[PDB]
Amino acid sequence: TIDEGLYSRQLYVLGHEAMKQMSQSNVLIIGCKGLGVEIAKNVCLAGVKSVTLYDPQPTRIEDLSSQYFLTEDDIGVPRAKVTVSKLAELNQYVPVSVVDELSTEYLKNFKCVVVTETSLTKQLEINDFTHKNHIAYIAADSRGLFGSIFCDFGENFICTDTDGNEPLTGMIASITDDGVVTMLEETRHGLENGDFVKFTEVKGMPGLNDGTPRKVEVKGPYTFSIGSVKDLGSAGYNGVFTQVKVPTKISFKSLRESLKDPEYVYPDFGKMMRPPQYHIAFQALSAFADAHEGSLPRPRNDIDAAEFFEFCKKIASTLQFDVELDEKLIKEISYQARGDLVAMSAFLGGAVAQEVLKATTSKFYPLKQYFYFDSLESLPSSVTISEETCKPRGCRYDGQIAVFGSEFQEKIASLSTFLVGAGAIGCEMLKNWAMMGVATGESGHISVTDMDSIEKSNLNRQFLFRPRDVGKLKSECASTAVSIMNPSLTGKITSYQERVGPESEGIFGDEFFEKLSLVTNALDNVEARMYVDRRCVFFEKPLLESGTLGTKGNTQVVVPHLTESYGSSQDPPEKSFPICTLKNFPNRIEHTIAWARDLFEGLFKQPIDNVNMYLSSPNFLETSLKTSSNPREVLENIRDYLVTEKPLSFEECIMWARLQFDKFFNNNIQQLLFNFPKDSVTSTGQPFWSGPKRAPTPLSFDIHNREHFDFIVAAASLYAFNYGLKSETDPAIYERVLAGYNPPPFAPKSGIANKDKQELKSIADSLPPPSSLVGFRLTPAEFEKDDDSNHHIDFITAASNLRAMNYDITPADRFKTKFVAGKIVPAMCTSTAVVSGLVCLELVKLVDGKKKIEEYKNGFFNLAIGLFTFSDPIASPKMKVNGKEIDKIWDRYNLPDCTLQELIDYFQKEEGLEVTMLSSGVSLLYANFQPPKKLAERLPLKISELVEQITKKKLEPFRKHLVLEICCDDANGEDVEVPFICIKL
Amino acid sequence: ALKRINRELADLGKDPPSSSSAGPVGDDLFHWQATIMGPADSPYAGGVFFLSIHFPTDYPFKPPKVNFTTRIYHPNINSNGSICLDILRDQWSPALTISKVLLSISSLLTDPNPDDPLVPEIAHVYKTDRSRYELSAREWTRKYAIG
Ligand SMILES: Nc1ncnc2c1ncn2[C@@H]1O[C@H](COP(=O)(O)OP(=O)(O)OP(=O)(O)O)[C@@H](O)[C@H]1O
Ligand SMILES: [Mg+2]
Ligand SMILES: [Mg+2]
């Protein structure tokens, strides 16, 4: 019943059972400020059964510092009543309500209770009831640059998945009678001691196929032991083992009991003595609020700081905490008590929403129990922060001014950023910039570029879009939405529809890139990331990269002249299977899926393109005869798709589908078995179909079978679409037409003048002339996974399952086929929120212009296990050139537009280096091993003229520089690396 | 990338491979037209085979793409010229020169590997009727690999 057209990406993270259990849970949220609204948004997008809000406090202006569903026309109205209407639109399956008053018994109606902006006494009163009634209780708090999370899911929490990883599966070479199991060649199982596994498709030991879990004894990186298997058999040949995961019982402690003896979670290992400080500090904040009618300490006030420290001392004495309080840090917590940032709110909202999903679905390992976080390194130091500058000014930025001050607000308001991409991270980044007030001054500006269009599956984690916006450009919708959120950004945002790449240099040129202040990436492919990194390196602009994958996320910051660039780090490459494995000898479902995709492309895409090009290009045949690798194949495809096998109705399409079934699942296997019989042996006497090779078996077409019928339907529908006919789905027509089919006789064949040319000429003279068919075009089938009515994934699944039946491989359903064929990347809204929060916390460091490399942090996190880590950026490598210090990445040579000979002489004289190779991009301009005549012809030419002559392409009018890569040798003959040359045209 | 390619090209220039001659197409450093000479003690004796080499962007951290152009009757080479070679898929390391790859391809030409073929019919003919395989290889290398 799960709408897989909307939760497509989330299901690959959670699953069908997890979401089905999640759609039956009620969540109550107390407090509707920035953190509360963020949690509510993430929960609503997640897909819980319902959400209830409770916040009777009337709105104030400063509450807009992080609440993006509030407007200045709502001042004086309770926050819940003005937030419910805007929250109800995020998801149509998640009703949102508001309760006027909250009685304790009412809490029995919900599955999870989230508490924010609530005093300690009320939290204790609520928890004393939600603990003994087995209701999950999550309490969050955000004070300035500090945050706290507390989780309590009862004393008998049952966790099914504890790490978020899929069960470990592997293919077995053989199993002895002593329980020793070995993987295939050079394959590591990766199991640990004490795990449980089950065996399937094991030959010789059918008893082990039941699935009863067995103990695992790791005997090595490639072998392990399971015990005694004497009774069931003596030896097992082949098979697949799958890990079995057992539930874990986690027992939480109530808030009242855990106040005295807390259990901490450390978000960073460089500072592990702080959480004991924050535990006292937050309780002191609550006590101070209770002692002054709920009013937190004023920003940067010394008297309130002293009183807060007295309260901290009293609390520490009362609770028998043997910890020496840190006056500086505690008073810092006091100063930023009234702060309210959107980056901290986004980070904690993502974390708490993930905790809510953990509580509802009984999946992943939750926080146990306290999580205290701080980003105090983001506090500016180049401006004046004091009581005079941090006082509120009666504006919507008070929650930020109380932390950073008015001067830093002016610094933020004059930014000129550039956001690449408008995905989920792009939407969150734009929201954060709108809330922070980025580029709201006279000299500020924002630019966002993206060339994709909104789809239904994107609405699950991109909250700036609506179902009515499907099909429109992302950048325009995002800019309009964020202008609505913050009216001051009206006219300060420019949205492009251009793909960032080599062809867009006419728009994103030197003039555009010389006015920016920073560049933020929200992309999803490595190529565009590398290109943007190179452009930033050339123009010396700070860059902010951020990526997500399911529940994992990372953020990196690149600073000019300080840290290394994005391209300095290399990631593991994608895995490509051997051609011989896909063509003849598959052994996994991925191989069959790849083969099915190739079959789809070669059946419904390439012949159509050849036919269309023949009917468009006047001289296609002659060029194809002497250019194409298989001109005979092209001619046969044209003949088959024009004359020989041109359908006239749907019955002929069904006949062709049956013919292709026989041709690809019955005859090719027969030929392969004829070439390599099942009893054949290698040159060494070993059996052939052994180990990584499985003996196939031809398929006989049984109409009553489901897979055969599915393949026939899909192939007939795709062929009819190619010829623009009308497809049908009733089984009656298929059964009737396929009943009267006579399979042509087939037998394997051993093989054994200008006749070939005359054969080609016979094919050619049979082709109808191009002029006879004018305006007749065939529609190629462009693969589209996201559409469910185009018969693409259905055909791929059917073909993959049929080939798996050929080679006795376990078939996969349409879910896994769609996941594999489409290269779908799992994604979550919570991960997006967290990465946006981290990026925006680094942005305030970038604005302040911090110089030391110890003040920046690259972040990594995994929400399936509650892991957060931060490490300093890697410094840019240095080098010695002519006895001088040179930065390897952020240095260049600036030279005029001189002749090649003058350039060589300059390098010989000024740098004392001999130039041995000079290239411009992918063209070799000059080399020391070229013949003298060519050099003498090229030496007296200017660099621009030389480049134009070599590349056979005139320089564009907007071109203003040339980047030259030069390899030069020293006087002794030793190669020395030098930075690139920036020729100024 | 570019520096490594230039180093390899200079090394090829200094030492003539005799049996091989690789060089960039036109002036593009990411497209080479390599030449291989048929081994003497092989059915492909007296034949010249031209190969297309495309270097990846992340070279040498990724293996190059090598495709035959002259038609060859070999068990491990199909009609499109694709090569079933170990040092081009997983055994590639950022230490092997293009001369090493050309030598490996020459060795593969010297003696095929029918145990794990790419064109089953050719491998079957090789394993069953060796003389017919020799005749077919000589006919193909005379029709296509000469002139
Ligand atoms: N070279 C590029 N220049 C500009 N924008 C780009 C470039 N490459 C990708 N993008 C944009 O980056 C965004 C990537 O976001 P995301 O991956 O979340 O969305 P998607 O790819 O459309 O969705 P999904 O992966 O869930 O099918 C998309 O808007 C894509 O258009
Ligand atoms: Mg898209
Ligand atoms: Mg994407």
Q: Which residues contact A68 (CB under 8 A, 6 or more apart)?
A: A34, A37, A342, A431, A434, A435, A485
Q: Phi and psi dihedrals of A292, rounded to 5?
A: -140, 40
CA-proximal residue: ligand 1, atom 13 (nearest): A423
What number does the ligand 1 atom closest to the CA of A422 have? 29
- Residue A137 pairs in a beta bridge with A113, A152
B127 lies within 8 A of chain A by CB: yes
Please count the CA atoms within 13 angstroms of the CA of A572 that sit on its side-chain side. 4
Region(s) of chain A under CATH 2.40.30.180: 166-244
What number does the ligand 1 atom closest to the CA of A528 have? 1
Considering all CA atoms of chain B, what is the largest pairwise distance in Å, rounded to the nearest integer? 49
Are residues B10 and A924, on separate chains, in Cβ contact within 8 Å? no
User: How far apart are the CA of B45 and the nearest CA of chain A, in angstroms?
Assistant: 23
Nearest to B84 among A580, A929, A967 (CB): A580
The tokens describing A710, both together, are 């599915």
Query: Phi-psi bin for A432: left (phi > 0), alpha (psi -120 to 50), beta?
Result: alpha
Q: Which residues contact A166 (CB under 8 A, 6 or more apart)?
A: none
Which DSSP state fits A350? H
**Counting Cβ atoms within 10 Å, is residue A117 exposed (0-12), middle (13-18) or buried (19+)?**
middle
CA A602, CA A799: separation in Å to the nearest integer? 13
Which DSSP state fits A890? S
Which DSSP state fits A72? G
The tokens describing A403, both together, are 């932390």
DSSP assignment of A490-504, as one string? TTSEEEE----SGGG
What number does the ligand 1 atom closest to the CA of A8 have? 26
Provide the Cα torsion A359, A365, A371, A375; round to 10°. -110
Residue (of A345, A353, A344, A349) closest to A46 by Cα position: A353
A682 lies within 8 A of chain B by CB: yes
CA A568, CA A873: separation in Å to the nearest integer? 12
Q: Phi and psi dihedrals of B138, rounded to 5?
A: -65, -40
- Rounded to the nearest 5 degrees, what angle is found at the Cα of B93, between the Cα atoms of B91 and B94? 165
Q: Which of B3, B6, B122 to mutate to test the interface with A (most CBs of A within 10 A)?
A: B6
B83 Cα to the center of ligand 1, angstroms: 35
Q: Which chain B residue has the Cα nearest residue A629?
A: B80
Way the structure was solved: cryo-EM
Q: Which chain B residue has the Cα nearest residue A966?
A: B3
Q: Which overall architecture, per CATH, does domain A892-985 show?
A: Roll (3.10)
Burial track A292-319 (b if 16+ CB lie within 10 A, e otherwise):
eeeebbbbbbeebbebbbebbeebbeee
Q: Phi and psi dihedrals of A310, rounded to 5?
A: -60, -45
Burial track A541-553 (b if 16+ CB lie within 10 A, e otherwise):
bbbbbbbbebbbb
Are residues B2 and A977, on separate chains, in Cβ contact within 8 Å? no
Are residues A950 and B27, on separate chains, in Cβ contact within 8 Å? yes
A860 Cα to the center of ligand 3, angstroms: 20
By most ligand atoms within 8 Å of CB, the mutation choice from A472, A524, A783 for ligand 1 is A524
Q: Phi and psi dihedrals of A236, rounded to 5?
A: -115, 130
The tokens describing A557, both together, are 């910051």
- Residue A859 pairs in a beta bridge with A555, A870
What is the bridge-based pairing of β-strands A50-54 and A96-98? parallel
H-helix or E-strand containing A148? strand A146-152
Say if CB A310 and CB A287 are below 8 A apart: no
CA A854, CA B90: separation in Å to the nearest integer? 39
C-alpha distances in Å from residue A465, one per residue of A481, A706, A831? 8, 40, 18
CA A710, CA A794: separation in Å to the nearest integer? 8
CA A689, CA B120: separation in Å to the nearest integer? 14
Give me the active site residues of A, please.
580
Say if CB A542 and CB A519 are below 8 A apart: yes
By most ligand atoms within 8 Å of CB, the mutation choice from A12, A451, A474, A508 for ligand 1 is A451
- Rounded to the nearest 5 degrees, what angle is found at the Cα of A148, between the Cα atoms of A143 and A152? 145
In the chain, the amino acid numbered A185 is E
Residues in A touching B78 (Cβ below 8 Å): 579
Q: Phi and psi dihedrals of A78, rounded to 5?
A: -55, 140
Give residue for tokens 């145990």: B115
Residues in A touching B79 (Cβ below 8 Å): 629-630
Burial track B41-62 (b if 16+ CB lie within 10 A, e otherwise):
ebbbeebbbebebebeeebbee
Q: Is A424 annotated as a binding residue?
A: yes
A115 Cα to the center of ligand 3, angstroms: 35
The CA-to-CA distance between both ends of chain A, in Å, stands at 63
CA-proximal residue: ligand 1, atom 19 (nearest): A423
Nearest to A929 among B10, B115, B116 (CB): B10
Q: Which residues contact A357 (CB under 8 A, 6 or more apart)?
A: A14, A22, A43, A46, A363, A364, A830
The domain defined by B2-143 folds into: Ubiquitin Conjugating Enzyme (3.10.110)
Residue (of A258, A182, A190) closest to A224 by Cα position: A182
CA A252, CA A130: separation in Å to the nearest integer? 12
Residue range A411-569+825-891 forms a domain whose CATH class is alpha beta
Q: Which residues contact A302 (CB under 8 A, 6 or more apart)?
A: A387
Say if CB B53 and CB B125 are below 8 A apart: no
C-alpha distances in Å from residue A512, one per residue of A414, A846, A847, A964? 16, 20, 20, 22
CA A425 and chain centroid, separation: 10
In the chain, the amino acid numbered A294 is G
The tokens describing A513, both together, are 């890139």
Q: What are the pocket residues of ligand 1 if the criterion is a CB atom closer than 6 Å to any ligand atom?
A: A 9, 420-424, 449-452, 457-458, 474, 499-501, 523-525, 528, 825, 827
Q: Which of A568, A580, A914 to mutate to test the interface with B (most CBs of B within 10 A)?
A: A580
How many CB atoms sit inside 10 A of residue A100's CB? 9
CA B59, CA A151: separation in Å to the nearest integer? 49
Nearest to B79 among A629, A928, A975 (CB): A629
Residues in B touching A965 (Cβ below 8 Å): 2-3
Helix (H, G, I), strand (E, B) or coil at A557: strand
The domain defined by A115-165+245-410 folds into: Rossmann fold (3.40.50)
Pairs of CB atoms within 8 A across A/B: 76
Q: Is A41 annotated as a binding residue?
A: no
CA A248, CA A947: separation in Å to the nearest integer? 67
User: How far apart are the CA of A920 and the nearest CA of chain B, in angstroms?
Assistant: 10
**Total residue count of chain B as it appears in this document:** 147
How many CB atoms sit inside 10 A of residue A696's CB? 22
CA A801, CA A596: separation in Å to the nearest integer? 9
Q: Is A706 annotated as a binding residue?
A: no
Give residue for tokens 């690259």: A858
Which DSSP state fits A319? T
Q: SS3 letters for A620-685?
A: HHHHHHHHCCCHHHHHHHHHHHHHHCCCCCHHHHHHHHHHHHHHHHHHHHHHHHHHCCCCCECCCC
Are residues B29 and A977, on separate chains, in Cβ contact within 8 Å? no
Give residue for tokens 């989920």: A424
The domain defined by A166-244 folds into: Elongation Factor Tu (Ef-tu); domain 3 (2.40.30)
Provide the Cα torsion A99, A103, A106, A112; round to 10°. 80
In the chain, the amino acid numbered A449 is T
Q: Which of B29, B74, B132 to mutate to test the interface with A (most CBs of A within 10 A)?
A: B29
CA A355, CA A362: separation in Å to the nearest integer? 10
Q: Which residues contact A792 (CB under 8 A, 6 or more apart)?
A: A600, A718, A781, A783, A784, A785
Say if CB A784 and CB A790 are below 8 A apart: yes
Say if CB A834 and CB A429 are below 8 A apart: no
Which DSSP state fits A187? -
The tokens describing A960, both together, are 């203003």
Q: Which chain A residue has the Cα nearest residue B68?
A: A629
CA A121, CA A867: separation in Å to the nearest integer? 30
Q: Which residues contact A600 (CB under 8 A, 6 or more apart)?
A: A718, A781, A783, A792, A795, A796, A799
Q: Is A461 annotated as a binding residue?
A: yes
In the chain, the amino acid numbered B110 is T
Residues in B touching A630 (Cβ below 8 Å): 79
Helix (H, G, I), strand (E, B) or coil at A698: coil
Domain A570-824 homologous superfamily, CATH? Ubiquitin-activating enzyme E1, SCCH domain (1.10.10.2660)
Residue (of A73, A91, A90) closest to A82 by Cα position: A73
The CA-to-CA distance between both ends of chain B, in Å, stands at 35
Q: Is A458 annotated as a binding residue?
A: yes
Q: Which residues contact A579 (CB under 8 A, 6 or more apart)?
A: B78, B82, B84, B118
Q: SS3 letters for B34-103?
A: EEEECCCCCCCCCCEEEEEEECCCCCCCCCCEEEECCCCCECCECCCCCECCHHHCCCCCCCCCHHHHHH
Give residue for tokens 């555009």: A512
The tokens describing A381, both together, are 């130091």
Residue (of A674, A862, A711, A659) closest to A164 by Cα position: A862
Helix (H, G, I), strand (E, B) or coil at A576: coil
Catalytic residue among B12, B36, B84, B125: B84
Helix (H, G, I), strand (E, B) or coil at A562: coil
Nearest to B118 among A583, A672, A927 (CB): A583
Which DSSP state fits A910? T
The domain defined by A1-114 folds into: FAD/NAD(P)-binding domain (3.50.50)
Residue (of A712, A714, A711, A706) closest to A790 by Cα position: A714
Residues 924 through 983 of chain A touching chain B, CB cutoff 8 Å = 924-925, 927-929, 950-951, 965, 967, 975, 977
C-alpha distances in Å from residue B42, one per residue of A193, B45, B47, B122? 54, 6, 10, 16
CA A390, CA A367: separation in Å to the nearest integer? 35
Q: Which long-range contacts (CB under 8 A, 24 or more apart) does A925-930 make?
A: A925/A900, A925/A950, A925/A964, A925/B27, A926/A900, A927/B6, A927/B9, A927/B10, A928/B10, A929/B9, A929/B10, A929/B13, A929/B14
C-alpha distances in Å from residue A304, one per residue of A279, A295, A335, A392? 19, 11, 8, 16
Task: Give the relative orientation of helices A34-46 and A79-87 as an angle to the nearest 10 degrees.
Answer: 30
Nearest to B2 among A683, A919, A951 (CB): A919
Alpha helices in A706-863 (DSSP H): 706-723, 731-739, 755-766, 792-806, 814-821, 829-848
Are residues B124 and A675, on separate chains, in Cβ contact within 8 Å? yes
**Total residue count of chain A as it appears in this document:** 985
Alpha helices in A497-547 (DSSP H): 510-513, 526-539
CA A369, CA A373: separation in Å to the nearest integer? 13
How many CB atoms sit inside 10 A of residue A646's CB? 11
B114 lies within 8 A of chain A by CB: yes
**Counting Cβ atoms within 10 Å, is residue A351 exposed (0-12), middle (13-18) or buried (19+)?**
buried
The tokens describing B71, both together, are 């038609």
Q: Which chain B residue has the Cα nearest residue A669?
A: B120
Q: How many helices (H) and strands (E) does chain A have?
A: 32, 34
Residue (of A907, A828, A824) closest to A861 by Cα position: A828
Are residues B120 and A682, on separate chains, in Cβ contact within 8 Å? no
The tokens describing A361, both together, are 């679905």
B10 lies within 8 A of chain A by CB: yes
Are residues B120 and A570, on separate chains, in Cβ contact within 8 Å? no
The tokens describing A21, both together, are 């259990």
Domain ranges of chain B: 2-143
The tokens describing A626, both together, are 């002497």
Are residues B62 and A573, on separate chains, in Cβ contact within 8 Å? yes
B54 lies within 8 A of chain A by CB: no
Region(s) of chain A under CATH 3.50.50.80: 1-114
**Counting Cβ atoms within 10 Å, is residue A679 exposed (0-12), middle (13-18) or buried (19+)?**
exposed
The tokens describing B106, both together, are 């020459």
Please count the CA atoms within 13 angstroms of the CA of B40 that sit on its side-chain side. 1
Give residue for tokens 């998640």: A94
